[model samples]
Structure formats: structure tokens, C-alpha cells
Target: GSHMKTIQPASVEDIQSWLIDQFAQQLDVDPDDIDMEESFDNYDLNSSKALILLGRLEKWLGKELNPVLIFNYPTIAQLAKRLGELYL
Candidate 1:
């Protein structure tokens, strides 16, 4: 929650933590269920869950991300890199 205000994390670790928490809370999964490298297909996420994640990113990042990024990157680590490219 407090992390929503953090833009440009000081370290990659911060990004990882924020991503794990955001995905877990938005998807109704335990934080342990998500690995930084695990694919969304492996996690069995559907379009609805993806939409929720997109909304969370919009709210926190303050920009609309194309939903296709989820399909393209699908994991926290990769998505973080993608976000960096867009926002950095």
C-alpha cells in the first residue's frame, strides 16, 4: 500500500517486493505463489486477474500500460524491466 507512492525504486529489490505484493494482493494469491521469474501461464492467471493487475499498475504508476505487456513479459522481473524502459 505504502509502496504505491514509490516511483523509481532505489534498488531492484524494492521493485521485486513491490511487484510481489501488488500481484499477490490483486490476484488473491499468497505472496509465495509468485516467483519473480515464473510465467503467468504457470500461475494459471486469467484475463480477469490480468485486468486487475493492469488497474493496480495504472493506479500506482500513474500511466496506462498496454494489457499486452502481461502477455509479453508475464513475470514480475521481466515486467519491471519493461516498466523501467517505459518510465525511466
Candidate 2:
């Protein structure tokens, strides 16, 4: 879908799935190929690209997130869990 879908009352798992989707699309890999707990560094993502991804996520999530959050969280599961706690 071209339109972004908002997940209301966002849960950790839901957010995890969203992050997986984004990462998969960005890496041009199958979603099933992504490891939820794998570090973003394991992918071809860099700081700037990760920040750009965070920008898009902020729009989808309707929240402002620290750019360094990705570096701190490092993995999709960790990042999603943190964000869910913050704004879910």
C-alpha cells in the first residue's frame, strides 16, 4: 500500500512488525529474511539512512524521536519495544 497505515494503541509486536517491514523494504530483502533481533549494523544501513528512516517513522507514528535512538536500540525488536514504551 502506498498510504501509510497508523497503528493505534500501538503494541510492541505491532511496532516490531512495522520496523521489520521498513527494514525489509529498504534492504530489498524478503520480510521473512529479516531477523527481528538482528542489529541494524548487520544490514547495509548507515547513520544518515537510519535517521531518514526515523524521520519517516516519526511521521507514521506521530511522534518525535531522538535520532540517536536507533544507535542506542540497534535492533528492530529493541527499538520497537522502546518506542512502544515511549508513545504506544
Candidate 3:
């Protein structure tokens, strides 16, 4: 059955904006340089950065998401969909 919970649906644009802003602030990159489709590998994202991102998202969502989700969906659009599913 479909759940009737009031899940906050995050749009692709919202995820993208939040990710870009957070990444820029956390990783010290200019927001303008963050490519929407660029892989974390391109940004030299190591374990530390990954952990940081995981913590940030967990806190922002107020839920513990599977850390591997980031690897499974490397883009903000895909991640947003996955997050919506999990929240629902």
C-alpha cells in the first residue's frame, strides 16, 4: 500500500543546489566549477570527503541513509529519487 506520510519531496534542483553549495563550502571549491554530472573521482573525493558528505546528509535528512547510496547514485538527480523512495 502507498504510504500517506507527509514526506518532504526534494526536487532535483533542490538537491543540486544544496549539494553544490555544501560541496563548495566543505571542499573549498567554487560553486560555479562544480559540474552536475561530474563524478566524485573527478573532484579527488577520498574517504574523508565521502565520510564528510555522509555525515552532512544524515544530519540534513535526520535519518541514517545507507552510505553506499552515494556510490550507487553518483548524481544529485538520482540521489534525490533514491532519497524520496527511502523517505516514503
Candidate 4:
């Protein structure tokens, strides 16, 4: 998470891999179970979890993202692209 602003830092793979690791560890699922194109709700991304991610990213980027960022971006690939553009 501290590396969110470094390395791939702004690539779709960064967010996708981070989510893969996060979900694999948090949900005890195989990293392969996650997909960048998949809808978050399909993976049980609850409101609280969603909010937490936004808060973390917003803080890390030191900027306010749209409240509907996740909803608007909707996928790891898209979100990463947006964040990359915004903060990279």
C-alpha cells in the first residue's frame, strides 16, 4: 500500500496485482480468482470495504477522488488508468 505511489505506481497491473494480493490474503482465495474486468460486487465488495479503499487511495494520492470513483471506474484496469492519470 505504501508502494501505491511508486513502481508501477500508475499502471493497471499495479492496481490489479494489489487487488489480487489483497483479496487473496483478505478473503483467503486464490489470486487467480480475481479478475480485472470483473465487477467488484461480484467479489462481494461491500460498501464499507469500498469506502475504505477510497479513503486509503485518496489519502495516498493526497487528493480527492470522485465519490463514485469505484462505481465509475468499476474495474481494476479502469481505476488504475484513472489514478495513473490523476497522480502519476
Note each model's CA RMSD in angstroms.
3.5, 3.0, 7.9, 4.0
In candidate 4, which residue pairs get closer than 3 Å at backbone N, Cα or C atoms, i.e. clash? Answer: none
Measured on C-alpha atoms, candidate 3 has an lDDT of 0.64
TM-score of 2: 0.84
List model 3 lDDT by residue over 1-88, tens digit each.
5322122336555555666666677667776667757767667466667777777676677787676876887766577667667763
Off by over 4 Å in 3: 1-9
What candidate 2 gets wrong by more than 4 Å, as runs, is 1-9
* Per-residue error (Å), model 1, residue 28: 5.3
- lDDT (10s digit) by residue, model 2, range 32-72: 77887788887867767887788878777887778778778
Candidate 1 per-residue lDDT over residues 1-88, each given as its tens digit: 4554345444556666777877677667866677889887767568777786677666666678788888898888998777767754
How many backbone clashes does every candidate have?
0, 0, 0, 0
Stronger candidate by lDDT (1 vs 3):
1
The top-ranked prediction according to TM-score is 2
What is candidate 1's TM-score against the reference?
0.72
| lDDT, candidate 3, at 41 | 61
Query: What is candidate 4's lDDT per residue for 1-88, written digit by digit as tens?
Result: 2432223345656756665655665567766776767877777577777776676566656677675877787777677777777777
Q: List the residue pairs that clash in candidate 3.
A: none
Best by lDDT: 2
Q: Candidate 4: lDDT of 23?
A: 60
> Where is model 1 poorest over a 10-residue stretch in terms of lDDT?
1-10
Evaluated at residue 31, the lDDT of candidate 3 is 62
Error of 2 at 36 (Å): 1.5
